[PDB]
Amino acid sequence: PARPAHPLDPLSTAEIKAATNTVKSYFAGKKISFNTVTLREPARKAYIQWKEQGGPLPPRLAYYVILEAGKPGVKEGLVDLASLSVIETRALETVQPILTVEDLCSTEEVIRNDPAVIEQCVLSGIPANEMHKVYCDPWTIGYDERWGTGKRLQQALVYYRSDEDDSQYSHPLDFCPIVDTEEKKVIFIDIPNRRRKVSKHKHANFYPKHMIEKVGAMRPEAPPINVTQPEGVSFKMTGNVMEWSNFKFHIGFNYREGIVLSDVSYNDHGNVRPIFHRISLSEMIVPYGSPEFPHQRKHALDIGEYGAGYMTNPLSLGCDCKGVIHYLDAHFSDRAGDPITVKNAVCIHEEDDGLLFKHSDFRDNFATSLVTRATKLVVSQIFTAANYEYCLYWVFMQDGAIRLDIRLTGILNTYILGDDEEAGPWGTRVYPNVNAHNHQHLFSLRIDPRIDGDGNSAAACDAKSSPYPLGSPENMYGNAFYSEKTTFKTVKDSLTNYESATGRSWDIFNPNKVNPYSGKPPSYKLVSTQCPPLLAKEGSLVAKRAPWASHSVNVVPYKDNRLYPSGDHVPQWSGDGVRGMREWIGDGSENIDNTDILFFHTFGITHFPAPEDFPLMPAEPITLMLRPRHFFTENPGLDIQPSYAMTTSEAKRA
Amino acid sequence: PARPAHPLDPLSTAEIKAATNTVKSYFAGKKISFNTVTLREPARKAYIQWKEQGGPLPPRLAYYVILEAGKPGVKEGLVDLASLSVIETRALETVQPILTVEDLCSTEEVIRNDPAVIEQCVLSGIPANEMHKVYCDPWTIGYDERWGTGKRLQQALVYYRSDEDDSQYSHPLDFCPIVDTEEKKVIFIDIPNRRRKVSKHKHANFYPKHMIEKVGAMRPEAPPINVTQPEGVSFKMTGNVMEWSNFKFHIGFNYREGIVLSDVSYNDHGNVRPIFHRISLSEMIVPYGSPEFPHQRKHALDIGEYGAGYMTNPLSLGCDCKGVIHYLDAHFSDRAGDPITVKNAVCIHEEDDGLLFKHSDFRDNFATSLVTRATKLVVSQIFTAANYEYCLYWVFMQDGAIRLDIRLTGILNTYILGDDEEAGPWGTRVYPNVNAHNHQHLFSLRIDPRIDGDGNSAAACDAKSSPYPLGSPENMYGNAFYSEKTTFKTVKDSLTNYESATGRSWDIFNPNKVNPYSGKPPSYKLVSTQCPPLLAKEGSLVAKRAPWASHSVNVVPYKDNRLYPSGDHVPQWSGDGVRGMREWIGDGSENIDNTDILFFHTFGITHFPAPEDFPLMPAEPITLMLRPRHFFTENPGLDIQPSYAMTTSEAKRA
Ligand SMILES: [Cu+2]
Ligand SMILES: [Cu+2]
């Protein structure tokens, strides 16, 4: 073939087709379809050897997942692209894999044509000949103990539109078809004991034409705010390699995690210093809080069950990325093994970010003054998970901090509410006959650190008052306080939650090195307070399927291919068994002090819906930050030209 | 004097001058000087009666605080401006008042000329002929049990500059002069047991000429990011009254709080609904955590001891404020009774704030899509508290939320460290011979609410799992959870802290009304997680002088002139006695359910310095939000013109 320059680059369309031809011919004479065809990233060691020790260029490898008509489960393996050969393969009869766009799109038509569904629609007050008005969002079944992984199943959350331009969410139906993905057939419908017929209300709609009817008129177009960069941008991309304000890193992308940032370094006045080997979102879970059947099956693990790459929007087509933008495209396989392309999947731009720092001297009434403005680099994507929109922004900053900002928008998952029916305490009546259930949105940030090089550790940092009492020689006036650092020795030590009582943060640090001034190891500190406990109980489906979510922090030894904390093949796993994070934690005893580590952080929000969220939700923000502390010997932004600067001597002259 | 357009408008220069003339006449023949002349805001009931019920126009009042030579304490009172007379007067012999720029600017020359100080400078390795190189930041003594309020005192934190353009903070000296503010003399010097002579290291500097020497060159000027509004702004000011995106409110300013936002309402399609009567920062405390003498005296309450108005920066020059800006000026009194003006004390602009909301339909590959961008309105000031800079941004949003964003920047407070000397655990060595002590920055946000009118209450909201166990009929799969709402009945109920274990928020709501969809009262929800516990122990000087800071939330009955929770005259109060928040809480039994209430919220950060913070610190962000929840019956931003919109029917067409 043709090799790309960079070993971390995503598979090209050529390489995807090369992978699938190879798999086609290895399974000669068998009806197979493609589920995933994606880069197998090289071993961390091989990569670092090639980057830094003159080691050989790692082989280019593609990971595939296929189904075979008439065989249970899946098959997966590795194709070596240089040699067009399958070098590893195995059958997994008892898992089900990520649901692709194609697996999903056929479900509405299946339910529209199914006779028992048609009858449920009639019983709900919709005539058999208006089946074109019935829509469904197709989900994994998630987990249902009636079937396990024995068939590949979806559940169809059913809605009604009066008009194709309606937002269907004001109009859920009461029942839930279960659909065999591979047979394209409804196998069961969950029907509640109390039937609730379709709402007779107007749809709750949100397009300008709708809004003109509903409130009289749109607001006048607002006077514009324009953003130009006449001399272009300060960042520089070579392929997928970004350089900007001393940062250098590789921007990757795959079907599952969406954006993957690799090989992050900071150029400290000629000394190029590693910070992270890899950072990405590795799994999510969005557990709903109504205990009534079948709503326990709402607990999407969006990343593992659908894919933040597979679900991602082409950007620009609307006004998502405002300004001077560099775009990246995404490439996948379809069922037949032909490359597909999502254009402008990733957007890269730089924005003003307010003040970086400022100080003035009161002595000459602030005539002595220095002000420097902040610019941030944003690498972003937006994915749509049926009703939800997840807006993901990786932000680099000029003090050397890296921030992840998320904005949740889209539409509430809704279920039907009867005239007389109370939504509380599990949900909110956000509109007549509409129940919006409580839920949480949780994410697992996976960090593979390489803080100032190799051999890292992690720690909790808790603010504590001095243990000495008020009025003692040691704490006369009772004000003394310090930071108590707890270095994690073994896996089990790391299993920790955010604590407001101590303003807890976590350090990822290199214990082999030492800041010359402070005497502390160089570190990036995780500052993150949007860290909900998992509300679902110990031993619940939610806690079993997402064992990473029960702690804000989980730190385990590095091994290759430890990406996905809820397992490689997420849908319809019951949560029983030793896999993903539960495997990596083990008996809890393995060393994580001064070695190669992986730090998985759980964060997100608990959402109690309100009418403000409906029919379309205003963005709700989530952020965490990773700040250098004792990494530099001083403010690393001081060499950036000030916006304004006047010395005490210049002030006197002026 | 001519009366203002609006009863909440700050005193004009003419009104200040009339007020001071009147006070000079009342005290004819007495050697008085002026500490404060400022608006006494109308009673809440009078303002509301005037505003909404065709009631009496409230008297225009000036409040004053004066000192008299050779008399202890202060005198304070009220001038009726219409009649140019003093209508209320009292002598307070045992308090000390806020320190004005003028009280402060004197101290440095006092200590330079004091033979005992000069001697200490010589002992410290600075020759007596070089006293012009010795500087100090003059702080209130804060509290010292050796003097009480018996004399008006400052403590001088002494530093050295080799050159006038140096940042002095790398070179603190070891001793602390105590200066009598009215006598203009040094009455004592705290001298430590272990002498540490002045640092022989170079100064840690940060202007471009300094960075050129230190690191060789400045980074090149970056390509610019230009922001223009060629058609003007969408906001409208009429005097101090702001209208923007359905919000209407009054922007005030005083010497102490700085920005005061009043009479805040939202125009909900022609129904103009009150939200807050008043919102501001009403106090701070910045408690240091080294127990060693005399560092217990560092716990500045910046608002009540110096004033966020008096300390505020004129904003135009820095390019602090980027874009099309509307400026307000502040007017105070000087010591002689003449009006002083700080130009451009408040900056007002609207900025881009990303996505307001987005949703696309996967059925036609996101062809069906609606995207609306968010604009935010920012009302901001920046104040300098000797070494610190506090950047304050009141932010209104198009979903009807209001946010306070703060960024801390400027310079760490530094004290000297011997060559030998360990900084930890109370401090960090951020540069050779420099100890930056641990400290908290805490703020008391004061909210006078009027949520959808009169009669309000407050509650804590705590996410909880169902109490029913996993596997019971009520919670079969262990996923059920709800929001537990605890309405405060009496003051004691309200005294509450942020809790990560429940992701706690607080509602301010109108129990007299009901949302017609959700059945819940209309509310603004306080969402705030940067809520440190107070680390100083109970009974400590810090906890006594700031009784409000030991709880994240305090809610008390409304009374006129309950502004300042550490008392009206803060410097040198021991923290003993029933005043400020202690007085308002009383015995904790008074009703606060469905009445006029005041909600005081403590938030901030705990700061453990690192070398990154020095010699000048990159901005550190703090934020809280007040969000409408069950206030509206739907997303209130839906009538804003989308940036992009395509319906399903429109997408079928091309
Ligand atoms: Cu949500
Ligand atoms: Cu600080």
CSV table of all heavy atoms in Angstrom, one decimal, chain B residues 62-91:
chain,number,residue,atom,x,y,z
B,62,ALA,N,-27.6,60.9,51.5
B,62,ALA,CA,-26.2,60.6,51.4
B,62,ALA,C,-25.8,60.1,52.7
B,62,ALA,O,-26.1,60.7,53.7
B,62,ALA,CB,-25.3,61.8,51.0
B,63,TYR,N,-25.1,58.9,52.7
B,63,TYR,CA,-24.5,58.4,54.0
B,63,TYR,C,-23.0,58.8,54.0
B,63,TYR,O,-22.3,58.8,53.0
B,63,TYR,CB,-24.6,56.9,54.0
B,63,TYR,CG,-23.8,56.2,55.1
B,63,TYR,CD1,-24.1,56.2,56.4
B,63,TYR,CD2,-22.7,55.4,54.7
B,63,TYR,CE1,-23.4,55.5,57.4
B,63,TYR,CE2,-22.0,54.8,55.6
B,63,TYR,CZ,-22.3,54.8,57.0
B,63,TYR,OH,-21.6,54.1,57.9
B,64,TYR,N,-22.6,59.2,55.2
B,64,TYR,CA,-21.2,59.8,55.4
B,64,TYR,C,-20.6,59.1,56.6
B,64,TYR,O,-21.2,58.7,57.6
B,64,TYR,CB,-21.2,61.3,55.5
B,64,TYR,CG,-21.8,61.9,56.8
B,64,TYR,CD1,-21.1,61.9,58.0
B,64,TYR,CD2,-23.2,62.3,56.9
B,64,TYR,CE1,-21.6,62.5,59.2
B,64,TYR,CE2,-23.7,62.8,58.1
B,64,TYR,CZ,-22.9,62.9,59.2
B,64,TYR,OH,-23.5,63.4,60.4
B,65,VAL,N,-19.3,59.0,56.5
B,65,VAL,CA,-18.5,58.6,57.6
B,65,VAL,C,-17.3,59.6,57.7
B,65,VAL,O,-16.7,59.8,56.7
B,65,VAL,CB,-17.9,57.2,57.4
B,65,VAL,CG1,-16.9,56.9,58.5
B,65,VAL,CG2,-19.0,56.1,57.4
B,66,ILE,N,-17.1,60.2,58.8
B,66,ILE,CA,-16.0,61.2,59.0
B,66,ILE,C,-15.2,60.8,60.2
B,66,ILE,O,-15.6,60.1,61.2
B,66,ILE,CB,-16.5,62.6,59.2
B,66,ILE,CG1,-17.5,62.7,60.4
B,66,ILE,CG2,-17.2,63.1,57.8
B,66,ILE,CD1,-18.0,64.1,60.7
B,67,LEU,N,-13.9,61.3,60.2
B,67,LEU,CA,-13.0,61.2,61.3
B,67,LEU,C,-12.9,62.6,61.9
B,67,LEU,O,-13.0,63.6,61.1
B,67,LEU,CB,-11.7,60.8,60.8
B,67,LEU,CG,-11.4,59.3,60.4
B,67,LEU,CD1,-11.1,58.5,61.6
B,67,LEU,CD2,-12.5,58.7,59.5
B,68,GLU,N,-12.6,62.7,63.2
B,68,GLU,CA,-12.3,64.0,63.7
B,68,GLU,C,-10.9,64.0,64.4
B,68,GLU,O,-10.7,63.1,65.2
B,68,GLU,CB,-13.4,64.5,64.7
B,68,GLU,CG,-13.0,65.8,65.3
B,68,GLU,CD,-14.1,66.4,66.3
B,68,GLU,OE1,-15.2,65.8,66.4
B,68,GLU,OE2,-13.7,67.3,66.9
B,69,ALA,N,-10.0,64.9,64.1
B,69,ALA,CA,-8.7,64.9,64.7
B,69,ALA,C,-8.8,64.8,66.2
B,69,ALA,O,-9.6,65.6,66.8
B,69,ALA,CB,-7.8,66.1,64.2
B,70,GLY,N,-8.0,63.9,66.9
B,70,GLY,CA,-8.0,63.8,68.3
B,70,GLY,C,-9.2,63.2,69.0
B,70,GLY,O,-9.4,63.2,70.2
B,71,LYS,N,-10.1,62.7,68.1
B,71,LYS,CA,-11.3,61.9,68.7
B,71,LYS,C,-11.2,60.5,68.2
B,71,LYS,O,-10.9,60.2,67.0
B,71,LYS,CB,-12.6,62.5,68.2
B,71,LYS,CG,-12.8,64.0,68.7
B,71,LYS,CD,-13.3,64.0,70.2
B,71,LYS,CE,-13.4,65.4,70.8
B,71,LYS,NZ,-14.2,65.4,72.1
B,72,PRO,N,-11.5,59.5,69.1
B,72,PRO,CA,-11.4,58.1,68.7
B,72,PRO,C,-12.5,57.7,67.8
B,72,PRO,O,-13.6,58.2,67.9
B,72,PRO,CB,-11.6,57.4,70.1
B,72,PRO,CG,-12.3,58.4,71.0
B,72,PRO,CD,-12.1,59.8,70.4
B,73,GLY,N,-12.3,56.8,66.9
B,73,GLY,CA,-13.4,56.2,66.1
B,73,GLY,C,-13.8,57.1,65.0
B,73,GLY,O,-13.0,57.7,64.3
B,74,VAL,N,-15.1,57.1,64.7
B,74,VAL,CA,-15.7,57.8,63.6
B,74,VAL,C,-17.0,58.5,64.1
B,74,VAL,O,-17.6,58.2,65.2
B,74,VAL,CB,-16.0,56.9,62.4
B,74,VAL,CG1,-14.8,56.1,62.0
B,74,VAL,CG2,-17.2,56.0,62.7
B,75,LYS,N,-17.5,59.3,63.2
B,75,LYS,CA,-18.9,59.7,63.2
B,75,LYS,C,-19.5,59.4,61.9
B,75,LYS,O,-18.8,59.4,60.9
B,75,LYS,CB,-19.0,61.3,63.5
B,75,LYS,CG,-18.6,61.7,64.9
B,75,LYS,CD,-18.9,63.2,65.1
B,75,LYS,CE,-17.6,64.0,65.0
B,75,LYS,NZ,-16.6,63.6,66.1
B,76,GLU,N,-20.8,59.0,61.9
B,76,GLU,CA,-21.4,58.6,60.6
B,76,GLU,C,-22.8,59.3,60.7
B,76,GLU,O,-23.3,59.6,61.7
B,76,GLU,CB,-21.5,57.1,60.5
B,76,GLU,CG,-22.5,56.5,61.5
B,76,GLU,CD,-22.6,55.0,61.4
B,76,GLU,OE1,-21.9,54.3,60.6
B,76,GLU,OE2,-23.5,54.5,62.1
B,77,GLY,N,-23.4,59.4,59.5
B,77,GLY,CA,-24.8,59.8,59.5
B,77,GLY,C,-25.4,60.0,58.1
B,77,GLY,O,-24.8,59.4,57.1
B,78,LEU,N,-26.5,60.7,58.0
B,78,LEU,CA,-27.3,60.9,56.8
B,78,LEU,C,-27.5,62.4,56.5
B,78,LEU,O,-27.8,63.2,57.4
B,78,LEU,CB,-28.7,60.1,57.0
B,78,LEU,CG,-28.7,58.6,57.1
B,78,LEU,CD1,-30.1,57.9,57.2
B,78,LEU,CD2,-27.8,58.0,55.9
B,79,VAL,N,-27.3,62.7,55.3
B,79,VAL,CA,-27.7,64.0,54.8
B,79,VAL,C,-28.9,63.9,53.9
B,79,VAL,O,-28.9,63.1,52.9
B,79,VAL,CB,-26.5,64.7,54.0
B,79,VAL,CG1,-27.1,65.8,53.2
B,79,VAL,CG2,-25.4,65.1,55.0
B,80,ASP,N,-30.0,64.6,54.2
B,80,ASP,CA,-31.1,64.8,53.3
B,80,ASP,C,-30.7,65.8,52.2
B,80,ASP,O,-30.6,67.0,52.5
B,80,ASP,CB,-32.3,65.2,54.0
B,80,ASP,CG,-33.5,65.4,53.1
B,80,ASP,OD1,-34.2,64.4,52.7
B,80,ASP,OD2,-33.7,66.6,52.7
B,81,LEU,N,-30.5,65.3,51.0
B,81,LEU,CA,-30.0,66.2,49.9
B,81,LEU,C,-31.0,67.4,49.5
B,81,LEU,O,-30.6,68.5,49.3
B,81,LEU,CB,-29.5,65.5,48.7
B,81,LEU,CG,-28.2,64.8,49.0
B,81,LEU,CD1,-28.0,63.5,48.2
B,81,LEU,CD2,-27.0,65.8,48.9
B,82,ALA,N,-32.3,67.1,49.5
B,82,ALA,CA,-33.3,68.0,49.0
B,82,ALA,C,-33.3,69.3,50.0
B,82,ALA,O,-33.4,70.4,49.5
B,82,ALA,CB,-34.7,67.4,49.1
B,83,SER,N,-33.1,69.0,51.2
B,83,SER,CA,-33.1,70.1,52.2
B,83,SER,C,-31.7,70.5,52.7
B,83,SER,O,-31.6,71.3,53.7
B,83,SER,CB,-34.0,69.7,53.4
B,83,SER,OG,-33.2,68.7,54.2
B,84,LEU,N,-30.7,69.9,52.2
B,84,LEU,CA,-29.3,70.1,52.6
B,84,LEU,C,-29.2,70.2,54.1
B,84,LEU,O,-28.6,71.1,54.7
B,84,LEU,CB,-28.8,71.5,52.0
B,84,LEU,CG,-28.6,71.5,50.5
B,84,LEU,CD1,-28.3,72.9,50.0
B,84,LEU,CD2,-27.6,70.5,50.0
B,85,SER,N,-29.6,69.1,54.8
B,85,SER,CA,-29.4,69.0,56.2
B,85,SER,C,-29.1,67.7,56.7
B,85,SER,O,-29.3,66.6,56.1
B,85,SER,CB,-30.6,69.6,57.0
B,85,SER,OG,-31.8,69.0,56.7
B,86,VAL,N,-28.5,67.6,57.9
B,86,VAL,CA,-28.1,66.4,58.6
B,86,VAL,C,-29.3,65.9,59.3
B,86,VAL,O,-29.8,66.6,60.1
B,86,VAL,CB,-26.9,66.6,59.5
B,86,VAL,CG1,-26.6,65.4,60.3
B,86,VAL,CG2,-25.7,67.1,58.7
B,87,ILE,N,-29.7,64.7,59.1
B,87,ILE,CA,-31.0,64.3,59.7
B,87,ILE,C,-30.7,63.2,60.7
B,87,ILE,O,-31.5,62.8,61.5
B,87,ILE,CB,-32.1,63.9,58.6
B,87,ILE,CG1,-31.5,62.7,57.7
B,87,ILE,CG2,-32.6,65.1,57.8
B,87,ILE,CD1,-32.7,62.0,56.9
B,88,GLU,N,-29.5,62.7,60.6
B,88,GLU,CA,-29.2,61.6,61.6
B,88,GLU,C,-27.7,61.6,61.8
B,88,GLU,O,-26.9,61.7,60.8
B,88,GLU,CB,-29.6,60.2,60.9
B,88,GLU,CG,-29.9,59.2,61.9
B,88,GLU,CD,-30.3,57.9,61.1
B,88,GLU,OE1,-31.5,57.9,60.7
B,88,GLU,OE2,-29.5,57.1,60.8
B,89,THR,N,-27.3,61.4,63.0
B,89,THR,CA,-25.9,61.5,63.4
B,89,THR,C,-25.5,60.6,64.5
B,89,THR,O,-26.4,60.5,65.5
B,89,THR,CB,-25.5,63.0,63.7
B,89,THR,OG1,-24.0,63.2,63.5
B,89,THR,CG2,-25.9,63.4,65.1
B,90,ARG,N,-24.4,59.9,64.5
B,90,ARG,CA,-23.9,59.3,65.7
B,90,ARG,C,-22.4,59.1,65.7
B,90,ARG,O,-21.7,59.1,64.6
B,90,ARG,CB,-24.6,58.0,66.1
B,90,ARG,CG,-24.4,56.9,65.0
B,90,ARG,CD,-25.2,55.7,65.4
B,90,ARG,NE,-24.8,54.6,64.5
B,90,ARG,CZ,-25.5,53.4,64.4
B,90,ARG,NH1,-26.5,53.1,65.2
B,90,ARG,NH2,-25.0,52.5,63.6
B,91,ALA,N,-21.9,59.1,66.9
B,91,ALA,CA,-20.5,58.9,67.3
B,91,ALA,C,-20.2,57.5,67.6
B,91,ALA,O,-21.0,56.8,68.3
B,91,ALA,CB,-20.2,59.8,68.5
